[PDB]
């Protein structure tokens, strides 16, 4: 675990837009571009966002990111039951020479 502050718990109705805010030291987010991840429970993790707005193969257009220097925001519009997963503001950085990881963002429906 590294210094990447992330809300561990979010919620909302299906169809809402959650905003995951992340911050820290400038060697973490200000230097290298913030990436974003998602892991389903008892499964493997998966990359969502790289280079502050760009997505790899296999993820939907609801997932969007932004970087404001050392600050960052994941925007996920139109929630459904796929959001039972913990999300990571995490990036390959040279702070302590590592792919520094976040604190999870696990959401449930109510």
């Amino acid at each position: 675990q590294s210094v990447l502050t992330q809300p561990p718990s979010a919620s909302g109705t299906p169809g809402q837009r959650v905003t995951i805010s992340c911050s820290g030291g400038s060697s973490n987010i200000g230097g290298n571009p913030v990436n974003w991840y998602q892991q389903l429970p008892a499964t493997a993790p998966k990359l969502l966002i790289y280079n502050n707005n760009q997505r790899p193969s296999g993820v939907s257009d609801r997932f969007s990111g932004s970087k404001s220097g050392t600050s960052a925001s994941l925007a996920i519009s139109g929630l459904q039951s796929v959001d039972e997963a913990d999300y990571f503001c995490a990036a390959w950085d040279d702070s302590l020479n590592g792919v520094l990881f976040g604190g999870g963002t696990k959401l449930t429906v109510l």
Binding site: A44, L47, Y50, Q54, W92
Partner: peptide, 21 residues
């Protein structure tokens, strides 16, 4: 434990392919 493949294709870094666990 997981593995991680970085998406280095004329793209960004992040790790698009993972180990299954």
């Amino acid at each position: 434990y997981y593995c991680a493949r970085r998406t280095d294709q004329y793209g960004s870094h992040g790790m698009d392919v993972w180990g299954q666990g």
